[model samples]
Target: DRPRFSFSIAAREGKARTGTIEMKRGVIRTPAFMPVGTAATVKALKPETVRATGADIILGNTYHLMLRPGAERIAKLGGLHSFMGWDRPILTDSGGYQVMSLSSLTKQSEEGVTFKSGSRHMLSPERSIEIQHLLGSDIVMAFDECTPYPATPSRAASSMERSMRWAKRSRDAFDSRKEQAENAALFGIQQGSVFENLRQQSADALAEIGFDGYAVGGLAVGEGQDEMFRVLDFSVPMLPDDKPHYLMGVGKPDDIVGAVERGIDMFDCVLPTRSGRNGQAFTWDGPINIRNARFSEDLKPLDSECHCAVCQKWSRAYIHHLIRAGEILGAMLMTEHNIAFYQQLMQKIRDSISEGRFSQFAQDFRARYFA
Candidate 1:
């Protein structure tokens, strides 16, 4: 079989686009929403169930996987896809976000990050590349410093510059492995907090380094949606248009829609899956809390527009009862429905963009969703 990674724009409506990302594992339809399979598995739902949601790809958490079960062990067992049983494209995060948010004892330097996770681990750019390789990651992110929100311009610049340096090292390390250069892929992250000029610098630096894809990493940390959008408004366009533009860890249905309007091509978020476990379901009308007392007597499917098996057979009343009783099945059904809804939403976005009416489509959808 051939190993390949490429993105092509199929249609465009304003900044929004419909496209396909061709890769060795599969052809990912874009703009695509990847379910967050953080532990190599989407919680509650099996891989087959996740695939049924129309996810062309799913994200794997590198920090947690490397911490437990160990990447070496997964490699010994036969790589992530074979190990996780997903059999589709999998994009592995570099673990930079989790390392900062999770580790209590951490130190950073020009060389890399020294942090204590299980015992003590040093996650340099070179090491991050190596671990992703060990896990047989199809799309590996360049090791980067995910600058926190509200950082001063100087601080953000310092961080973004360092991330660019690490990006270089990550690319070099990934290239050191001969097979990966021809087979797998690596993506660079653009980070400069909310500073437009710095973001341009970051983009220029990353474009100079060059990556198979580019991800906007600094938003969604705590900056409100408007601010995040403002950053992406200018920042996303700074990236090379021909490559896949990814908005990392971006949020709710509205957030995804807004980013798509700003030209984001790929996204992954845990909102649907996490909200599912919490008994919240996303309906086109808006999100609904399944455990609400009103739902206990409502006999409708979770969403009238949804045709997923969970909605096909289960009533909101019954699902409500299960969730209130803390039944595991409730979580599974809710998760399945949310994931299905997100995929369905992405399908609509793709179809709308291809047909050249994204503005009206987004306006109508957001009004309905947010109202």
Candidate 2:
């Protein structure tokens, strides 16, 4: 048996807070950055390697898993933890986001969303929870429509209201699974597009239904950083103060830093892993393309400041050669370094918050990183 979910804040600097979430699988440090494990894998890197990067948790996609090897199949094989060989906690999205995005054949009703993924598939709140339970997700996200960006105020309100209804259904669905509910946690999503009033309405409704945690959703959907930050400035405070407030699908290094300063505790994205596979590596100085000709004869590590195995053992020249030659090892090494870099950034953020110097740290980081 594992412990129940709980969160505690150690310190706060302005709106920026440092904390830890205790779960059965592990302790997730806050202002945490969770790397995406889209298909039971963090793309090119191994689970142990991801953990070594200082990540306490990783995200699994219910949409991908349910459509692929299938959730039932994974459960039959001993759940995601045993299947992926990552003993740490896994948070599974409710399939709502991907169902809307990946499936061309999509229909939405008050009950749920129907989409075509290989064959016809319907993802209601219950089914979404069942899938995540099958995968043994430590944090099960509620099924809600990720409101499209640049929407009319009316459209946004309608979408947000519908998501609120779905959030209730998702909560009930999660509670029905007594065994899974006992061991796992469910988080309700607050989706209001960009309207301050709509966001407030969504938050109050979700808070009434209650959840193990809360997430600020419908953001990072092509909304620029300024707009996204504006939304967070208002939205983050609407969430329950005691529960972990997760900002879903959030962003670049600066975006995470900014969101944490606005009181976001958890985040996940495909940026680092995706960029790494594309031969782009993230450095404290910013991102650099390894395929750049300037690195062909240069012998420095990917990032001189990085303490990753790839940076420790390999030279930029060697990495450049591998990428140029289209070697698979090139993707692996680059991805590992990027993940390590992101984790290091999260640690730095947490430390600065604890020491009550996050504002200064963020200022200094932005100056160097954006320079």
Candidate 3:
């Protein structure tokens, strides 16, 4: 087996940290934001533009690909990176979350999760590992159940315990994949639904099993920002500081900042991309709905301070017009700006942590953005 992915803490400012994950493809800068490229592509933008936005990595979903085009098809077409034309690092989820959340129907067991595909009717952990291996992803997530939120403490505990068992099975399956073992890295996910004790228990289990990286799962399902942050405050310190800490399916601009301040090093979310498609644009000043009538005649950049190509070349008036007129360019332009905004946010976070000015930076950001 190849050496597990390595994380180095380059600098620190209190609990906030700047680090790097050295992968076979490249080094992912810490406090990094990975654009969600679910189903293989980051919608509405080209791979080159995505790279230019300062993203060191992108995420692919195992569930979608496995159903639509099939993993074998992707491998025959030359793997995910080649098919998507994103040569930089790519991380593929284990399809566990989607099976639990997005699938129309599913049955869980100690053997693994079984779910009906839109086209077919069966998926399992062994299949998930096979799919990611075919994708040739740089960072592959371990298959585990994502406990739903709003469950009682006892229910949450039961779900987390099952996930821990699945984690061990996932590791065993991945270790058997010799080709994947040599090229890609696997990360363990910690799942607990807003319970501090369960969160600590999950973290401790993953650490004992050992993983290249660790992700905080089961948050951001329905929990509010305060609850999510509260869980992280207690859960993060339980993880190994040397490994990269990923927060999955997280959140708004402020959510990312808060997570980093709590010592998270990696994040992937659909907020920017999905919001952009739906006429919500994330700017430094907060999100603006481009379809709103107030922007029909106003001539201003989405964010006057943003230097993204879309913001530099387009106006809010034009974006509003395009969106209202049912033009696809609106989604394209808005998505570009949103991704750029997130990347720039990560860069600023990294710089501030390196310079030991993260506290002041966070304060200034919240003051202006919150207003």
Residue 344 lDDT (model 2)? 93
User: Please, what are the lDDT tens digits per residue for candidate 1 over residues 219-331?
Assistant: 78888998988988999899999999999997799999999999999999899999899998999999999988999899899999897999899999999999999999999
Check candidate 2 and list the clashing pairs: none
Write candidate 2's Cα lDDT for 166-221 as tens digits: 88989998899898888999999998899999999999999999998999999999
TM-score of 1: 0.98
Off by over 4 Å in 3: 1-4, 117-119
Kindly give the stretch of ten consecutive residues in candidate 2 with the minimal lDDT sum.
96-105
Candidate 3, 1-371: lDDT as tens digits? 22447788989987788988887788899899999988788998999999988999999988888876888999999999999899989999887787568645777677766675554545556777788998888998988778777889998898889888878877888889898887788899998888888989999999999888999999888899999999999988989888889999887989999999898898999989998989999878888899999999978899989999998898999999999997999989989999999999999999999998999999999998989
Steric clash count of candidate 2:
0
Clashes of each: 0, 0, 0
Pairs of colliding residues, candidate 1:
none
Better of 1 and 3 by lDDT: 1
TM-score of every prediction relative to native: 0.98, 0.98, 0.96
